[model samples]
Target: SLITQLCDAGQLADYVGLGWLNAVSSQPYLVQALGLQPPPRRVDVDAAFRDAKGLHGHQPWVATPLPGQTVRALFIGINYYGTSAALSGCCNDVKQMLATLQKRGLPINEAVILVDEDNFPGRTDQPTRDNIVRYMAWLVKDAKPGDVLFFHYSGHGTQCKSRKYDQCIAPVDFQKSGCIVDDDIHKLLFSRLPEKVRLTAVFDCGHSGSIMDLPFTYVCSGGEQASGTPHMKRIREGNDVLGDVMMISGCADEQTSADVKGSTGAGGAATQCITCMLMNNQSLSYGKLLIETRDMLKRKRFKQVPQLSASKAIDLDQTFSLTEMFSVDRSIQ
Candidate 1:
């Protein structure tokens, strides 16, 4: 009965689904009549996730696997270098930060990093793309239904006609007319493993940084500047397939990210924030980290925009309550 109510969508209902809006609006009246307080929410961290129209979409519940149910999945980090090249202070720092995750005891199988220096100067090699796809394929080879998978990308991302509002991050040798489509990524994820796998994606790229007319070269001048450019578009640009993936991007489609000059430090605004929080907020959960990072970044008045994007398939609407792997408490062990 509950499933029917939650999943019901008549043929005619597709054209109209504002039912939740009306229900929430009248919630106060019902509460007053019934003499009941509002539902006890964990926190108001999700208050800011409303759309431009000031409407909050249906928030799915966050689900965590039972203790010890998570399998050791794969980790993929890319610093892509196409014909134009992808440079980020964040990528430089991420290599080290990810290393720390390994040391702190995460279920990371293998990590593949593309640093296009000299010979491959820009990792614009076909092998770069091939290797990543190959790695993903391998990661899901024997994964169980409830396994946890994480993929991290830190580099230049561009928008093209193919991508709707969200832009695509170019691989080392991405030479297609438009940038990599989300469909391609979805297929890569869907093809491997069964339908029960859980995924968490972290994108440290800008949605509007590299549009077709603007071109990637115009924006990434060594990847340090956060340019303010506005391009209007819808959220889902004609994508046919959907899934339950949870993703957090560095910025929104309209916001630009900071490209720091120092290769030594994690120069990207988003990554630096994560780096800073690694030591102190070791016990902070994903939701907590997001709120703290967003608040801290806003206070700094950094030009870059930080946005979190999640899939309808994933129900992780809870506050990130866990600590960073680096600072995770070992006392429980």
Candidate 2:
């Protein structure tokens, strides 16, 4: 039909006049137009695993892999000085975390500790919105496969009452930059890292659930659920998955975190529990760590429940190694 139409339009004059039209044959177009209503494309789970590092490999980088073996951390603890929401335990939380992580082997200098009590002439180690974002980005700027990036936030967190706002954390200078929202944190830190890198995040504040938008979140409790019966639900609940990220929040989205005062020193209830567990058990896997922290809090009669979330479904039985040679048993699914 195209040949006839072209000849009739005088566009095939040479071929037609040369009497070669009889020998011409038509073929199907190499690229055809899309259908008016095409079905939605499905993600290939098996294919996605094909490019992943071998099942037994140390680090599995999905794409653009790199080699790195360093541990970095950003510790932000804020005690809103002269403000009504002033906290007494936030600074202590940071100090305790720094001490524990360093004892477990992270270099002291690689972990940036920011608290409200110090002023370094030109720059203050205050947990303002800008400084928090700046230091978090810097921590993972050169992140590579097998590298560990740790983040700890001990302060106040809030969920948006109106649709106009978003879930955010309170900084020292909240009056100026408002608060650091979840979107900005993910864009700067979590979303920027490669698949092989690991990030361990601890948010010791209220309304911290789903703070990083990680793929999987576990509800840690003291009862029979502590045995890892029913698995965690995905945060967004779909085929979506992330890589090499884990988070432990102070409480559920609707709950408030308790700032306990007295004994040893004042600090967030969840933060104290996590610190104690890590200090005592230096070899617990990520999965078991959540259970241990929750049980510890429950035994202390703390009302808030700690939550654990990961970028993807992971093996709860694997070691909590923050470096290369870290292995995960993903076959539990």
Candidate 3:
């Protein structure tokens, strides 16, 4: 709206407060109101999230759930505090999401939240790669054939640029430790799950198209099309997992998710749209979920589009409720 107020004409220098990159986001509208084109997104990973990467050898892992709670979750977010690649909303993203899930039947005690703020001197819950893997393992620990496991990440994400082109999510201690690649996430998080298990992983990061390396993807052809296609890619040489997994990614593998700033705080454009949509209506199907989320982003003027993928090529019309997935509650109210 401020941009609209300045419609009378404000200096390009006045736009500087929005940050150079963000101003570019409004360029086309500015051009129309003043004109713009898409540039290769280069955030300050060094000075900011350009300002925001790594890998590590790992020991064999095991399946071990702490117990009793059927809907277990691992919510992780990071806002790299003392570095050039700092973020502002990730920690807030996870904390708010934890409360959101609880209202839908996720037990507060059963949900593991990892944020950099808590990682500070007082608490041990951190979004470091090691803890990420460990708690991801914790998510699927118990050997129940029927359970719902959730994983949510809000932070800086990058492409590995290796032969596999895996997506690596930034850990707060990313400089000292390393990134947790999508491949590693699949290997450690999904490899050993038993049959009938349900896991919903949401990544509000960059280059996360096939982050879970899931076989089927719901392709959005753009516009207010209102419908999407679920396409199955050729099998990865050895991509095999037993649990039913679904991923909600912030952008296509080529785009960057926005770390939008507001008067109170900042947040990922993806997560904001997500919680906004789901909070308003919890019974949305997978198909409706994606389109509505996209619609919400479009209304908010966000550039990134969200993606949905599943381990198997199931129909996109399935209901997306965590409670329904766990309790098998298909009864409509």
Best by lDDT: 2
Clashes of 3: 23
Clash tally for model 1:
19
Q: Order of all candidates by TM-score, from best down to worst?
A: 2, 3, 1
Q: Per-residue alpha-carbon lDDT of model 3 for 182-225, expressed as tens digits?
A: 66777666776777887877777633444577765554435434
Better of 2 and 3 by lDDT: 2
Candidate 2 per-residue lDDT, tens place, 88-131, comes to: 66665665665555444443224466688664111225677656
Q: Tell me the TM-score of each prediction against the true structure.
A: 0.50, 0.67, 0.66
Tens digit per residue, CA lDDT, model 1, 1-333: 111232343221111132221221110000001111122211111221111122111211112324434533333334444433445333444443454343333443333344444432112223244444554454444456556566655554554352034345455555532234444454454434455555555555533322212100111112222232211122443333232344444443243446558111112544444443454435644434545565555455443444444333111223241121112222211
Tell me the lDDT of candidate 2.
Answer: 0.55
Q: Which wins on TM-score, candidate 2 or candidate 3?
A: 2
Worst 10 residues of 1 by lDDT: 26-35
| lDDT (Cα, 0-100) at 26 in candidate 3 | 18
